[PDB]
From Swiss-Prot:
Family per record: Belongs to the ETS family.
Subunit structure: Can form homodimers or heterodimers with ETV6/TEL1.
Organism: Homo sapiens
Signal peptide (from-to): none
Entry's localization field: Nucleus
Domain PNT: 8-92
Function: Sequence-specific transcriptional activator. Recognizes the DNA sequence 5'-C[CA]GGAAGT-3'.
Name used for this protein in its record: Friend leukemia integration 1 transcription factor
Illness: Ewing sarcoma: A highly malignant, metastatic, primitive small round cell tumor of bone and soft tissue that affects children and adolescents. It belongs to the Ewing sarcoma family of tumors, a group of morphologically heterogeneous neoplasms that share the same cytogenetic features. They are considered neural tumors derived from cells of the neural crest. Ewing sarcoma represents the less differentiated form of the tumors. Bleeding disorder, platelet-type, 21: A disorder characterized by increased bleeding tendency due to platelet dysfunction. Clinical features include epistaxis, hematomas, bleeding after tooth extraction, and menorrhagia. BDPLT21 patients may have mild to moderate thrombocytopenia.
Residues of the full protein shown: 114 to 198 of 452
Misc note: Located on a fragment of chromosome 11 flanked on the centromeric side by the acute lymphoblastic leukemia-associated t(4;11)(q21;q23) translocation breakpoint and on the telomeric side by the Ewing- and neuroepithelioma-associated t(11;22) (q24;q12) breakpoint.
Length: 98
């Protein structure tokens, strides 16, 4: 670090955050892309092929598995994304089970 930082073009926003719905299945062809670049800049992910999800609708994003994800992102990242989407998938602005 220490200055000299020229990372990629972050997503658009008022200050610095993402605006997407709870359920990932409702994510549009754009949302899936926004959330991607986000988790990357947030969890400092690398070696990820965002292009693979250039046209992957939220629906096709929640159906993807470790394998399908491994063909676009590294194993490490595959564990983060899957884990993250795991919760968002089981959450629709509703109450908690148990």
């Amino acid at each position: 670090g220490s200055s000299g930082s020229s990372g990629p073009p972050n997503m658009t926003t008022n200050e610095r955050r993402v605006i997407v719905p709870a359920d990932p299945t409702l994510w549009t062809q754009e949302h899936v892309r926004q959330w991607l670049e986000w988790a990357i800049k947030e969890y400092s992910l690398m070696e990820i092929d965002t292009s693979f999800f250039q046209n992957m609708d939220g629906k096709e994003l929640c159906k993807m598995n470790k394998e399908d994800f491994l063909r676009a992102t590294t194993l490490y990242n595959t564990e983060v994304l899957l884990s993250h989407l795991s919760y968002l998938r089981e959450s629709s602005s509703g109450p908690s089970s148990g």
